[PDB]
Amino acid sequence: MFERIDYYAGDPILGLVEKFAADNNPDKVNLGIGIYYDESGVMPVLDCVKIAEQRIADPISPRPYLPMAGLPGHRKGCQELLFGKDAPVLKDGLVATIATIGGSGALKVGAEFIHEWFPQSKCYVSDPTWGNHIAIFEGCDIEVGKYPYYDTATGGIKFDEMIAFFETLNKDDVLLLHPCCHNPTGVDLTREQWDTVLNVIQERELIPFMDIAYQGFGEDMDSDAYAIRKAVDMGLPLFVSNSFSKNLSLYGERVGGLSVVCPTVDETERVFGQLNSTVRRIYSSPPSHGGRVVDIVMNDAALHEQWVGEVYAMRDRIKSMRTKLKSVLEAKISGRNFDYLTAQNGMFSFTGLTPEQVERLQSEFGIYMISNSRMCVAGLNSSNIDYVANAMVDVLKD
Amino acid sequence: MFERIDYYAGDPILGLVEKFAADNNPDKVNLGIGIYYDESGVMPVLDCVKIAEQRIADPISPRPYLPMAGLPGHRKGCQELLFGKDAPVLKDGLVATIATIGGSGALKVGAEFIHEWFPQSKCYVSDPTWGNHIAIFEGCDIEVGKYPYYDTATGGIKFDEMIAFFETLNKDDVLLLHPCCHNPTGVDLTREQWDTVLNVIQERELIPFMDIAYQGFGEDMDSDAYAIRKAVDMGLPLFVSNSFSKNLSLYGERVGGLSVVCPTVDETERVFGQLNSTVRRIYSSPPSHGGRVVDIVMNDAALHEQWVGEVYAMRDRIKSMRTKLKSVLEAKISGRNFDYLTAQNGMFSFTGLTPEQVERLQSEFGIYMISNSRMCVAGLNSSNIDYVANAMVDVLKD
Numbered sequence: 020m021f022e023r024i025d026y027y028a029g030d031p032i033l034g035l036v037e038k039f040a041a042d043n044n045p046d047k048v049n050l051g052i053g054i055y056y057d058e059s060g061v062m063p064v065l066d067c068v069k070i071a072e073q074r075i076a077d078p079i080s081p082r083p084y085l086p087m088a089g090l091p092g093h094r095k096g097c098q099e100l101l102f103g104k105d106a107p108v109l110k111d112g113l114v115a116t117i118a119t120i121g122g123s124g125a126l127k128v129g130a131e132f133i134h135e136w137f138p139q140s141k142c143y144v145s146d147p148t149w150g151n152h153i154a155i156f157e158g159c160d161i162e163v164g165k166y167p168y169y170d171t172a173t174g175g176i177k178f179d180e181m182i183a184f185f186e187t188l189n190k191d192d193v194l195l196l197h198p199c200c201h202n203p204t205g206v207d208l209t210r211e212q213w214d215t216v217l218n219v220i221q222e223r224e225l226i227p228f229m230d231i232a233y234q235g236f237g238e239d240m241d242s243d244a245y246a247i248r249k250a251v252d253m254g255l256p257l258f259v260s261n262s263f264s265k266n267l268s269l270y271g272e273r274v275g276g277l278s279v280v281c282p283t284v285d286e287t288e289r290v291f292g293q294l295n296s297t298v299r300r301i302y303s304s305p306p307s308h309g310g311r312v313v314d315i316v317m318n319d320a321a322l323h324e325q326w327v328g329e330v331y332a333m334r335d336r337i338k339s340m341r342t343k344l345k346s347v348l349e350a351k352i353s354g355r356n357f358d359y360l361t362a363q364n365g366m367f368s369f370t371g372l373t374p375e376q377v378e379r380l381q382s383e384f385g386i387y388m389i390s391n392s393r394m395c396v397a398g399l400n401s402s403n404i405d406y407v408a409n410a411m412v413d414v415l416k417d
Numbered sequence: 418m419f420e421r422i423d424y425y426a427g428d429p430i431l432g433l434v435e436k437f438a439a440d441n442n443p444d445k446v447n448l449g450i451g452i453y454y455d456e457s458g459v460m461p462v463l464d465c466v467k468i469a470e471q472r473i474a475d476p477i478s479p480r481p482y483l484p485m486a487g488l489p490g491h492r493k494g495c496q497e498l499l500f501g502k503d504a505p506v507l508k509d510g511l512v513a514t515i516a517t518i519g520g521s522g523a524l525k526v527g528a529e530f531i532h533e534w535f536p537q538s539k540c541y542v543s544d545p546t547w548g549n550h551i552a553i554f555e556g557c558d559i560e561v562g563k564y565p566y567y568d569t570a571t572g573g574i575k576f577d578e579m580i581a582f583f584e585t586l587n588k589d590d591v592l593l594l595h596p597c598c599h600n601p602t603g604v605d606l607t608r609e610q611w612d613t614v615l616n617v618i619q620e621r622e623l624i625p626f627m628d629i630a631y632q633g634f635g636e637d638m639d640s641d642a643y644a645i646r647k648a649v650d651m652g653l654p655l656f657v658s659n660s661f662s663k664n665l666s667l668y669g670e671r672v673g674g675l676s677v678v679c680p681t682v683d684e685t686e687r688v689f690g691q692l693n694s695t696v697r698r699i700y701s702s703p704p705s706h707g708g709r710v711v712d713i714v715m716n717d718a719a720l721h722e723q724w725v726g727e728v729y730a731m732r733d734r735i736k737s738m739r740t741k742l743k744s745v746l747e748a749k750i751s752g753r754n755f756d757y758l759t760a761q762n763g764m765f766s767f768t769g770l771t772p773e774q775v776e777r778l779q780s781e782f783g784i785y786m787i788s789n790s791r792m793c794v795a796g797l798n799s800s801n802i803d804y805v806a807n808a809m810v811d812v813l814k815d
């Protein structure tokens with residue numbers, strides 16, 4: 020019956036974790052997945068989340084469906100985090116926001132909405148990007164291409180090329196953008212680049228579709244949202260998919276949001292309505308448990324403040340890993356430059372290791388990165404840093 | 418920017434849920450909603466769930482992504498429940514199963530899979546059906562029609578007509594089937610009818626897509642799953658979306674499954690792979706909280722047994738309300754037969770009231786049913802059963 024159904028090759032990032040469990044090298048190390056681990060190498064349970072879940076757990080409550088859009092306070096916490104507490108665009112009722120099944124479900128609901136209402140829009144993703152952006156958009160029958168971003172040769176951005184490419188795009192073509200903490204390269208635009216990008220976006224009338232899964236891991240919560248809040252100020256038709264997977268350490272609960280910034284309240288009404296309708300035909304409504312945790316942490320003034328501190332500890336450990344690895348590597352290999360390690364932002368780093376050298380890391384050391392050189396900096400900690408730095412030094416010499 | 422995006426009319430039921438909210442009759446009763454309430458008229462928290470969630474909160478754990486297919490134990494519990502504990506189809510590795518975001522999410526991933534790999538298949542839903550069914554399949558770009566099912570004239574099934582309509586369909590056209598507890602009518606097929614339906618599907622090479630959202634509410638877990646199990650035994654290419662929303666009383670946590678019965682292990686692998694690819698391009702992976710509740714309740718033998726007793730308590734409660742209702746109707750309305758009220762199974766009942774009779778129940782008694790006569794039997798309990806039954810007697814007598 021199903022003989023023609025192709026095998027699924029598997030998710031790239033996952034068949035790699037698979038491969039990692041199977042290695043029995045003692046000092047092995049997963050730097051391949053995009054998960055935050057702390058100093059001891061485990062996924063934190065945030066204290067704020069812990070309190071929120073104690074509240075959810077007492078009493079165990081009835082479990083009716085959430086609204087299609089999710090919990091009002093979940094959607095409000097997404098909006099405030101992204102646009103700023105009490106931002107004008109929110110006072111004006113100019114953002115249609117739903118809770119979504121992770122940042123992944125936000126991209127999906129946004130792509131389905133775009134596919135339906137702007138069927139001629141094409142989407143362009145950064146070259147390179149998180150592989151899933153492409154499959155999600157294409158899974159909607161949206162035509163997907165790449166804009167020039169990372170410059171392999173310099174490790175910076177092909178800024179002029181990128182802008183030049185934006186200038187060829189049609190009205191309402193979508194650009195799928197990373198406000199900060201680029202994945203996979205860690206190489207981010209400066210504010211000035213953003214202003215330039217957003218000017219082109221306004222001038223060409225493109226749809227900016229910002230995907231933010233690491234807010235608070237770049238510089239701080241507000242700075243990381245610069246490109247969003249500035250698109251807002253510029254009256255752009257900004258779509259924002261946001262994920263709480265990483266900054267709430269709550270991957271498995273599937274908590275994110277999708278927000279669409281509208282010129283007028285009537286358009287918010289129309290967009291919001293259709294967002295709900297698009298939710299309905301997909302999974303009907305989102306998960307209560309994750310919703311509540313977001314609702315309670317975002318809107319409880321003290322848990323909110325605590326959460327911000329916990330996210331910033333995560334942000335700083337990654338920075339100190341970057342700093343530590345850079346100085347370790349620069350002590351141990353002469354005349355090589357690892358500035359990229361500290362110029363990059365967030366969980367990811369494009370190490371500039373060759374696909375071959377990434378192999379050597381697997382085989383000779385049981386250190387896993389993605390073959391494109393992406394490393395998850397959060398996989399490094401003081402117990403493994405010296406073994407990883409050394410394995411890198413070794414591998415940078417055949 | 419968005420002026421041309423149609424307003425969304427909202428959840429078809431909300432025209433009712435708000436008119437009820439506004440009704441000022443102090444004895445108003447909302448029988449229009451599709452939720453199970455217990456003997457106290459509230460959504461129950463099941464004791465097995467309550468225990469499962471205390472286990473989830475002790476200790477509060479890290480929240481890594483689940484597999485795209487959900488927890489192995491959640492996938493297993495769905496299989497055993499649906500197909501039978503240690504069923505040959507399971508022991509032979511012939512069921513591709515994923516956890517899903519409720520049954521909605523199962524129907525969605527299934528529909529997308531049919532649309533991707535059987536792009537010429539149309540889907541037929543029962544006349545009448547649970548309207549979300551249609552939107553989910555049409556939202557995949559699948560053409561949707563209906564098969565004759567409910568007989569307005571007799572309160573029974575247009576079985577000859579339904580069968581004759583199946584005889585006209587194309588190989589691989591999909592029938593969305595309700596193995597038991599028909600929604601919205603409560604009118605089910607007998608096992609002999611299933612036998613004939615399944616022969617015709619087999620002879621016409623149709624894809625039976627069984628959607629089981631109320632297992633345990635018809636007769637019992639095994640029997641409710643008769644059609645499922647008979648389809649497997651006959652070797653049909655069965656799709657089964659199951660929902661734990663009603664029977665775990667877990668609506669908001671979004672817990673269901675999708676199972677695809679394959680003729681070989683290799684087909685199992687291709688279909689499973691592709692279900693995972695589908696999940697990936699939609700929401701990446703399912704929610705941990707509801708997933709752990711399903712895993713723990715399904716696979717803890719004591720909890721599983723407690724769960725079955727709890728469901729059968731709901732099953733019996735609804736029957737007690739159908740019996741009492743029937744009994745008052747038969748007593749006060751001479752000559753007229755109400756056997757259909759206790760022949761129907763599950764939460765919903767096509768009561769046989771005309772639309773005019775339904776309008777009179779709202780306007781005269783504040784009793785709210787869907788205009789097609791759909792009444793949620795679980796909405797009735799010792800506090801309102803005499804009121805509702807007497808009001809219906811009045812309305813029928815007129």
Ligand SMILES: Cc1ncc(COP(=O)(O)O)c(CN)c1O
Pocket residue numbers: 053120121122123124149197202230231232261262263264270274275700701
């Ligand atoms: C750039 C980007 N966008 C969105 C997401 C969303 O994943 P989730 O569904 O877990 O939020 C991720 C996590 N890989 C990401 O890296």
Ligand SMILES: Cc1ncc(COP(=O)(O)O)c(CN)c1O
Pocket residue numbers: 302303518519520521522547595600628629630659660661662663668671672673
């Ligand atoms: C026939 C049928 N199928 C599937 C579902 C799925 O809803 P859920 O997504 O919560 O499982 C429903 C509503 N319980 C239904 O009535």
Ligand SMILES: [Mg+2]
Pocket residue numbers: 063064065066329
């Ligand atoms: Mg901590």
Ligand SMILES: [Mg+2]
Pocket residue numbers: 158159160556557558
């Ligand atoms: Mg589609």
